[PDB]
């Protein structure tokens, strides 16, 4: 219980890939993430890009320690694998939908574990790639993750949208529909 | 399903009443279980699962490791709060308020910070259904308030720290 | 003014 909660930061490393994630959060929102392959800090706001600076080397050094720590605890826990959780998907608009005026469709994918997910958009059954953005795996108090995917569009009576989510916790790929 | 071994390290800061109260909690998690942690209020590493004692005892025996973590209240928490005061804590985004029939819903979208007060007033009415505060994830919030409900005009009053005076939107 | 960050403590090898 506090006025402001910050994570400086969320350090993630998993055997599948292997893959990792470094990010800083403040009051439940992602400030920046470090692209581990590009060794680059990516701020999630123009205000942050102009004012704030973080050295990606510290993120990469942290993941190297996590890799060491994971291999030590794997041997300790007698090789205990991660339990796959069933994710919760919620689809909604950013602003009030009006025919002709540009809007954004938000796809909240909550309770993600392990942090390996495929979030894609389908317009009238056919796949869409243009104007698609995504957040990183945002942390939860119960040490699970949530990811939010976006779709910029032009609302019309001809287009119907679906948020396709693929996860190991699911038998069949989950599809949450949206209608204007 | 493929086999996966997940490791997480969360270095968290807890701020209360500006710079008066500062607390840090570092969490070491295997898969989903937090086996060891460091609470600035405790001052030492503590095992929180029988998977934690070899880690917690080793880190506490090393003086250089213990002192670095203790100092992380200043080198991380207090250092970054000063960077938040000039950026995040000064971010004020005015909300977009539009009344559309669905019942008349008051759409209060794209605002930051979370602090919001929306009331329907004609005099103030009681018996309104308000959805929980929605996080858009793009550093903006949205909230929708619906009311039960000739010649009378309905006004939606919205209070936010970004506005000196509330935005009044009528529906004749 | 560069951002500060927490360091993970190394597990005993």
């Amino acid at each position: 219980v506090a006025d402001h909660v910050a994570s400086y930061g969320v350090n993630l490393y998993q055997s599948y890939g292997p893959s990792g994630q470094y990010s800083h959060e403040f009051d439940g929102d992602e400030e920046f993430y470090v692209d581990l392959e590009r060794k680059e800090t990516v701020w999630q706001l123009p205000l942050f890009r102009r004012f704030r600076r973080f050295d990606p080397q510290f993120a990469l050094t942290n993941i190297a320690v996590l890799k060491h720590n994971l291999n030590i605890v794997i041997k300790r826990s007698n090789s205990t694998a991660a339990t796959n959780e069933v994710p919760e998907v919620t689809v909604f608009s950013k602003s009030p939908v009006t025919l002709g005026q540009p809007n954004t469709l938000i796809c909240l994918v909550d309770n993600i574990f392990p942090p390996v997910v495929n979030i894609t958009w389908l317009s009238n059954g056919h796949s869409v790639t243009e104007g698609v953005s995504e957040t990183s795996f945002l942390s939860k108090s119960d040490h699970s993750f949530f990811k939010i995917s976006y779709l910029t569009f032009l609302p019309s009576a001809d287009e119907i949208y679906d948020c396709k989510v693929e996860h190991w916790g699911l038998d069949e790929p989950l599809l949450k529909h949206w209608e204007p | 399903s493929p086999e996966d071994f997940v490791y997480q390290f969360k270095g968290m800061c807890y701020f209360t009443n500006g710079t008066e109260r500062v607390r840090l909690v570092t969490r070491y998690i295997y898969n989903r279980e937090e086996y060891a942690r460091f609470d600035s209020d405790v001052g030492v590493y503590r095992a929180v699962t029988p998977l934690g004692p070899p880690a917690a005892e080793y880190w506490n025996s090393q003086k250089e490791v213990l002192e670095r973590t203790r100092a992380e209240l200043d080198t991380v928490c207090r250092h970054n709060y000063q960077l938040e005061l000039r950026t995040t804590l000064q971010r004020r985004v005015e909300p977009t308020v539009t009344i559309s029939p669905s019942l008349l819903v008051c759409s209060v979208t794209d605002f930051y910070p979370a602090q919001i007060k929306v009331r329907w007033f004609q005099e103030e009415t009681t018996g309104v259904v308000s959805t929980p505060l929605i996080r858009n994830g793009d550093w903006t919030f949205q909230i929708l308030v619906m009311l039960e409900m000739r010649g009378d005009v309905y006004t939606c009053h919205v209070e936010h720290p970004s506005l000196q005076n509330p935005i009044i939107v009528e529906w004749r | 003014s560069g951002e500060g960050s927490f360091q993970p403590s190394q597990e005993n090898p």
Epitope: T61 | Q62 | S1, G4
Partner: T-cell receptor, first 114, second 109 residues
Framework: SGVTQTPKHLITATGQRVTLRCSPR?????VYWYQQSLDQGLQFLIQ???????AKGNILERFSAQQFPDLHSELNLSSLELGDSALYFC?????????????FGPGTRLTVTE | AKTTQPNSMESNEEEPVHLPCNHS???????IHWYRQLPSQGPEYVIH???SNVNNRMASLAIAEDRKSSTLILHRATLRDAAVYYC???????????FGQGTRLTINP
């Protein structure tokens, strides 16, 4: 200190290639290389942690290093120049975490001659 | 140079020495490290700190309230403590050590 280096001394001709060995302290995961020349003083070259490169200095392309599975390190100096005549110090720390002090080896004294 | 130190310092054996260091451009994430190098030897760690007075088995470190300066205190320097003392700024998360000119300490028998 606990850190050992081989050879202690080296006398090489210009254009030759040379390999410097280093053993960190027992338990130390991070290994480091430094050059101590009369012209530039003590200069950081490279750092390895658990066999992977973590930090780099103003290390020339001629210079290259490696950390092996037994955590021991090797520094390779190719196309040797008279200016490469320096003290090459090895160092090690328990880990890469910034609180860990560095323990230095006795150094390799290299003299490059025409 | 991130740190500035006097070039040389002379002292008597079995007497305290106060080695000063200026570092006005320090950051809230930087530590103050002190290393030394004895003649024909590899560098050796002395002490490191963040704020105020720091002590260990080898020395004391007095960091100024504004953190823009510090002092290394060798409580009883012997003839074996004659070395070059380097005052180094290093980020609390970094390992790379940047050695400047330093102070060459001469101990008089």
């Amino acid at each position: 200190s606990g850190v050992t280096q081989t050879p202690k001394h080296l006398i090489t001709a210009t254009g030759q290639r040379v390999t410097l060995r280093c053993s960190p302290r027992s338990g130390d995961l991070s290994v480091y290389w430094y050059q101590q020349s009369l012209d530039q003083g003590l200069q950081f070259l490279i750092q390895y942690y658990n066999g992977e490169e973590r930090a780099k200095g103003n290390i020339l392309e001629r210079f290259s290093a490696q950390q092996f599975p037994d955590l021991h390190s090797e520094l390779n100096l190719s196309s040797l120049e008279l200016g490469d005549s320096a003290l090459y110090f090895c160092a090690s720390s328990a880990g890469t975490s910034g609180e860990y002090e560095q323990y230095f080896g006795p150094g390799t004294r290299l003299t490059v001659t025409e | 140079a991130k740190t500035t130190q006097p070039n040389s310092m002379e002292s008597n054996e079995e007497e305290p020495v106060h080695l000063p260091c200026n570092h006005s451009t320090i950051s809230g994430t930087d530590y103050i490290h002190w290393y030394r190098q004895l003649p024909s030897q590899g560098p050796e760690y002395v002490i490191h700190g963040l704020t105020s007075n720091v002590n260990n088995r080898m020395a004391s470190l007095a960091i100024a309230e504004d953190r823009k300066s510090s002092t290394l205190i060798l409580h009883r320097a012997t003839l074996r403590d004659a070395a070059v003392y380097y005052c180094i700024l290093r980020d609390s998360r970094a390992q790379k050590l940047v050695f400047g000119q330093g102070t060459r300490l001469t101990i008089n028998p």
